């Protein structure tokens, strides 16, 4: 089928020499041994070996449907909000949560860090969480309240199931165990955030049990002066394909928190999230508007935040 | 390309080495050179050079085909694929056409993915032919396809059969999707009687997602990659007769309030037809041709995603 | 003897009564302005029988965008004919030829082989080349920083075209695209020294065509509209 | 921070300096296609360089249990 050398990721300088020598399609380079290919063109043996490596080197909708059911959705203890989302925050997809400051995005982020560790036998997912904090809002003591509160709620169901296996998963589920699976990451500038996002695909391969990645703040609170040039290359390319591919290969869920949007950052940004939610006030009562989704029509619901955590109205 | 043994009968190292020494490396130079200066001088048989030149030229060149003969083949093989959405089908004049590159434009949440899923489901159930859905942004959802299928029939065996006819692939960077397209081309070339496959439609969701990162700075390496992708899609469409469909973003030119595609002047010449989707209500989307070779532009109408 | 340019299109070449000897013309404009529509208009004039207003001379068409729409051509021919039928349009198409070229090297190989075509079809007195600027971006990268290397293959095709156009007195209607920024030349000098007339297209359905003639440095303007019957000069 | 402290080859550092690149911050602002042009490296090779550069500035991981225990 005569693959063309412009489609391969060969280095730009090496490609120029290869074409000048007369090579056009990759099918010509397959037979030639690396020893001779280093002489016909002005490149080293290492390059000759690297080049020939690149030159040589799925599921149907029915199968994807089966996997979609099995992979559990992450709940938020809000049966109303969880209803519009289709059951819960899904895996293998990116989510965004916009809203003016002071509306409770970080509360929903924290509540999801705990709700991802719930044992599977209660309908959870049994996974760990990564918390890339950019605004420095993480407060561990708050997680304790959201944690111990959930266990009390989890304890009130196991007594009605009698001798089922719940009494062992409950022993496995404990406050210290819960807090020993929340990984923190403090980023103070765009360069640090970019560096961390670059290494994240490695940190995840070492810990196959991680199932939630949170980015608390996609836009820095004080994007100013030369930093505006640094914001590009992160919203561009970076936080649109790095998060989608990372959230897919490892089969996890990614959540991005945004602060600029406040009503019903680049024109192309709007296309960067598979789902998007908007928080706003109305008569001093919180609302959770769903604005974009490829599987749920637009709708609105109500919620309130209590010491026990995110909850229905 | 470069000369090599076995590229055509009558070629060997003991002659290829002579040609290489005499500054004759590739086929282009061999056919554009003077044979007598190479044959009578430098000691090479004139007849052998002539035969080699003619064989290479015949083997590596296009052969013109009459118009009358091509007309029958086109009329017999060309087909029109219904898009399911009745009104938009009328707007397109019976819908998609095999052998052309169609494109769809629209801002966030304007129904570009819903229309693609509708076409996929309709082609999978009604005509009962396979489909390849190259997903670059995770837009594909298995549940939505099952819902749209249920909206047509209630049999559980028909739905199960239909859902197995849609292949799903992922590509989050330019190179992966190029590899996927070349793999599809090779599979179609090798498989000449495997009707169990024989993909008849291709949907490349958000072709702008894997091209926007490549463009930036004063470099020009991105433009070559984008044009290579465009050539890949063009050949997939025309040579193999598969109705390709593409999805692109939108933007506003800074000089005027008009809308236009997002990938620049080089890209605008690629699609053979363009459909612009806009909002005038959850549904009630508005469509209007912005480019075509068979109809006037600007014919505005209405569609509703609430049902399709 | 090739028919004079003033006969092919009286609405563009109203002062070209002399028989043509290897002239070259070029079209230039943005997308969706009517370059390919004109080539259907000229193609229709040259293949229709003389009884219906045509010249009855074969044509060769070279495509590199794969944008040639067979149906759009045939719908024009049936409209223009006084009494269109299947057995009539067959002969009208019988004088039309088509080729596809995938890359500059393939195009150059094709040109060296087209020398045999005209030696067998003397009536073939028109030649069209769609989107001569298709491979510019790809080739400009493979050639590196050396300009001489970027344009190597495009130059050779230019030297080949000029040789074919004069050995057999043809007319070449090349087509280009507006890719950088009225006009902004980007192709090589080995080609731009050949074009005689350069015509520009605009959009507002009313289409305006501007002609510049480097033979005499004369400028003009025309108008036309595109209907189901093809191009109509106002 | 300057690149020559990160651990890059001395030879390569000059190739960057000829393009007016001195700090890690300037390095990160470039896209992969640019870095290929200004380095001569393959696509995968540039990713290794990006990982190397980022590994000298990325933050240190911290478990939630530890922070609670001070
Ligand atoms: N089941 C449904 N019923 C009705 N409308 C729906 C349904 N599912 C989705 N929608 C509508 O589809 C809209 C999303 O459109 P779609 O998924 O096609 O976007 P898109 O063109 O892919 O967007 P993006 O540019 O972000 O990729 C939602 O806003 C909602 O209006
Ligand atoms: N049958 C028709 N009736 C009315 N208008 C038509 C008809 N066919 C085409 N048009 C219009 O005429 C123009 C056709 O232009 P044409 O096909 O020549 O494009 P082009 O200049 O080759 O474009 P590109 O190079 O960008 O592909 C478009 O405005 C199209 O809307
Ligand atoms: N334990 C709690 N009980 C009730 N309300 C709380 C509690 N903690 C915080 N809040 C409320 O949450 C709000 C802060 O939300 P915040 O996390 O800042 O949202 P965002 O991260 O989107 O700015 C405050 O207005 C406060 O009233
Ligand atoms: Mg906050
Ligand atoms: Mg989509
Ligand atoms: Mg055109």
Numbering used by the authors:
A (entry chain B): 10 to 66, 84 to 290, 301 to 349
B (entry chain C): 2 to 281, 287 to 314
C (entry chain D): 20 to 200, 222 to 244, 251 to 280
D (entry chain A): 4 to 73
Share the article's original sentences.
Here, we used cryo-electron microscopy, AlphaFold2 modelling and structural proteomics to define the high-resolution structure of the RAD51B-RAD51C-RAD51D-XRCC2 (BCDX2) complex, revealing that RAD51C-RAD51D-XRCC2 mimic three RAD51 protomers aligned within a nucleoprotein filament, whereas RAD51B is highly dynamic. The proteins assemble into two distinct complexes, with RAD51C mutual to both: RAD51B-RAD51C-RAD51D-XRCC2 (BCDX2) and RAD51C-XRCC3 (CX3), but molecular analyses of their structure and function have been hindered by insolubility issues. Biochemical and single-molecule analyses showed that BCDX2 stimulates the nucleation and extension of RAD51 filaments, which are essential for recombinational DNA repair, in reactions dependent on the coupled ATPase activities of RAD51B and RAD51C. Our studies demonstrate that BCDX2 orchestrates RAD51 assembly on single-stranded DNA for replication fork protection and double strand break repair, in reactions that are critical for tumour avoidance.
BCDX2 was purified to homogeneity following expression in baculovirus-infected insect cells, and high-resolution structures were obtained in the presence of transition and ground state analogs of ATP, ADP.AlFx (2.2 Å) and ADP.BeFx (3.4 Å). In atomic models, the three NTDs of RAD51B, RAD51C and RAD51D, and three out of the four C-terminal RecA-like folds (RAD51C, RAD51D and XRCC2) were observed. We were unable to resolve cryo-EM density for the C-terminal RecA-like fold of RAD51B, but negative stain electron microscopy (NS-EM) 2D class averages revealed a mobile feature relative to a structured core, irrespective of the nucleotide present. Thus, the C-terminal RecA-like fold of RAD51B is dynamic and RAD51B’s interaction with RAD51C is driven primarily through the RAD51BNTD and linker. The BCDX2 atomic model revealed striking similarities between the arrangement of the RecA-like domains in RAD51C-RAD51D-XRCC2 and three RAD51 protomers assembled in a nucleoprotein filament, by the stacking of the RecA-like folds and nucleotides bridging subunit interfaces. However, in the RAD51 filament, the NTD of one protomer binds the same protomer (in cis), whereas in BCDX2 the NTD of one subunit binds the adjacent subunit (in trans). Finally, the alignment of the RecA-like folds of RAD51C-RAD51D-XRCC2 relative to three RAD51 protomers within a filament shows an open configuration (25.2° decreased curvature), in contrast with RAD51 where tight protomer contacts provide the high degree of curvature required for helical filament formation. For the cryo-EM analyses, BCDX2 was vitrified in the presence of ADP.AlFx or ADP.BeFx. However, we did not observe density for AlFx or BeFx in either cryo-EM map, and instead observed that RAD51D and XRCC2 bound ATP whereas RAD51C bound ADP. We therefore suggest that the Alphafold2 predicted structure corresponds to the active intermediate during the ATP hydrolytic cycle, whereas the cryo-EM structures represent the ground state of BCDX2.
